[PDB]
Symmetry: D4
């Protein structure tokens, strides 16, 4: 039952992902590299991940499990220096949050858990 570690790691990973999505958003918001259509897309994903991270917290208490929170790490930079480097970063970061959601799911498959099969 090492899955509890994967819950709090999935919790802190989406929490981190919205934090990276937030600084990406307000980077394109600076007067200097104004790209309104990108600052809006990244702000929304920031809110989308922050909501999905809380949905998993609620589903944890529904399962009688414990929630341990770690730091939300600093985003790897404050300037992404481009809309195309940040898209590379979000593309790999979106894959990291969805592969880890799949990683934690194959753990609950090998041990049939009717409540951990969701998330």
């Amino acid at each position: 039952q090492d899955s509890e570690a994967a819950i709090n790691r999935q919790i802190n990973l989406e929490l981190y992902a919205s934090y990276v999505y937030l600084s990406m958003s307000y980077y394109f918001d600076r007067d200097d590299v104004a790209l309104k259509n990108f600052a809006k897309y990244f702000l929304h994903q920031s809110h989308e991940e922050r909501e999905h991270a809380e949905k998993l917290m609620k589903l944890q208490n529904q399962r009688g499990g414990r929630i341990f929170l770690q730091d939300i790490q600093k985003p790897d930079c404050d300037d992404w220096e481009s809309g195309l480097n940040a898209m590379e970063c979000a593309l790999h970061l979106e894959k990291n949050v969805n592969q880890s959601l799949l990683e934690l799911h194959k753990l609950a498959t090998d041990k049939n858990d009717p409540h951990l099969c969701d998330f």
Copy 2:
């Protein structure tokens, strides 16, 4: 200026992605494999992609470009037969819609276009 092909292909790709996200959602909605927490997640992504696909349509008319719509292809199946195979499919499909968004962006970088730099 082959980018117009990549616009309508990006338009039809997100339109398709929400269509796959919809059948994934209502698959877990069938009384037989009831996984409410998955049918809700896939329904939301279906609405999220359908909205983002229309956002790109609006940004196209803001650019004086033409919008050509193709069929929204049938989802590759009506039963995903698992919550873990569908997660594999969405993980690769989410990567296909975000890599193609990056593909179309490096095309507009090589030809500076101040309006196509967004999307």
Copy 3:
């Protein structure tokens, strides 16, 4: 019990109708034939049909029935070339989606089904 065919055909017909309503909307959105009050009306009907099409999908799983999705056919054109030809098209297309809803209802009348009597 040929009605299941009429369900998936009613599902794919409203799905198609919103797709036609979408291209109609963004046609009047092009800078060239800007008719803001028409692009707004057709965008709303597109969202109205897409919602009503999902309502019927939900009502199908409530009935233990199967949902089979076909392609959403390409709209018959990308340019309607007028606000009055498109109104003819939507008037006949709105009649086609409401007559087929009535067609499927007289099928459930001849075979009393207390759940198929709704839709």
Copy 4:
């Protein structure tokens, strides 16, 4: 310029259509013929037409035109006695409100009016 008559007639026709859609809705709401999924569909169309009727009123004052209101006629019955007779009635009534919208539009085509071309 007989079109002003067609405006107030289109205004009072959608106003009437929502009134018929309302009594249809609360008919299926009576404990006796409870068909929740029909009372909800007709309530929404009642709100949809009442909104669209006010949208045309606003567009009239934008055109400097006069708004004359007539009675909202009594719905042709208080009991539709069936979900299939009411669907016939709404199908023909939906056609009457969309054909008259097309009727008024071919009037503004023969006399180019850049503001009456919308509605």
Copy 5:
């Protein structure tokens, strides 16, 4: 049990009151007597009464009672000719809808009805 007459009369009275509130609203909306802050107040009361009129319809079916709809009479004029004459009219009309709500309530007091005591 003459109260059913007072229900449908209270139903048609609020329905009428929103109809008067609507024409009052769009009167101050005409370019000629533009008083934006009045057209907004009367539009809202029009929506407020139309909602409260439907709330009473729902409460009627909860009571197993019948709903009979009459015409929504034409508003007594299309031009109120002033913001101060219309305020007189709404002040007396608001009193007419709230006194009749009290009239119908003293009828249900004299005959204890635990469901008609609300409205």
Copy 6:
């Protein structure tokens, strides 16, 4: 220019009216005299007046006028002891807030003020 007194008196009168509407609402909310349909109606009017009272405050600063706030007087009782005595009270109190709105309007008529003509 005694109208400023009538502004702050109209401000404090609607502020008071929502305060009376609030205690009326939560009176019918007590387990003892549970009349859910009345506690909901009075809660809404409480929110409706509190909003309309702030709308007049905003319109005052748009006019460069001063806003002086007095106490919101205690509601005349905590128990209305009936749904029919409170309806009498609200009927007269609704008339007091709408007559005073008319009182302040005939003051601005006698002295043409293009901004005080609204409210």
Copy 7:
């Protein structure tokens, strides 16, 4: 059981706090000391406290307790004369409403009350 006094005092304290937050908001709204970003922050806290004050009223009727309302005292001034003096006032006033919420909670701790432990 002196806690009922602390309920109505907590009720009237948040009611007062929103009243102070309202005049603070519309003070910075006057053309003279226009600080839009402050008038918005204080308007929101005014709505936030007014909502939280009603939440406690509802929780009181859930507990079968009585609600006695006092006057909402006049805010200590109509002009705060600065954005920094008002911040001092709100900082101490926010502490007064949260310490009193804690004051009332240690009263319910000393007397175990499973419903008063919330608020």
Copy 8:
């Protein structure tokens, strides 16, 4: 011009405060110490601070200033062990975020800055 340090410190302080408000919320959400009315209050403050923290980020780019993000520190515990100790913590933490907002404001007073005077 040491104020930029106080901006990013105010940004990271509200970001932290919502993070503490979140774990406080879902602590009372655990089946073990279920206090629904507290988990709801702390969840809302978590969303309220997360929004207010982004409002200050937007106001920073409006000022041409730089945004540097630090870690969101781990909340000082995962269990507050009581609803009364957490209220002490939030009372002092709410004072820390509002005193620092006042601290940064007296810095902009001593150096008249017409845009930093808001926040």
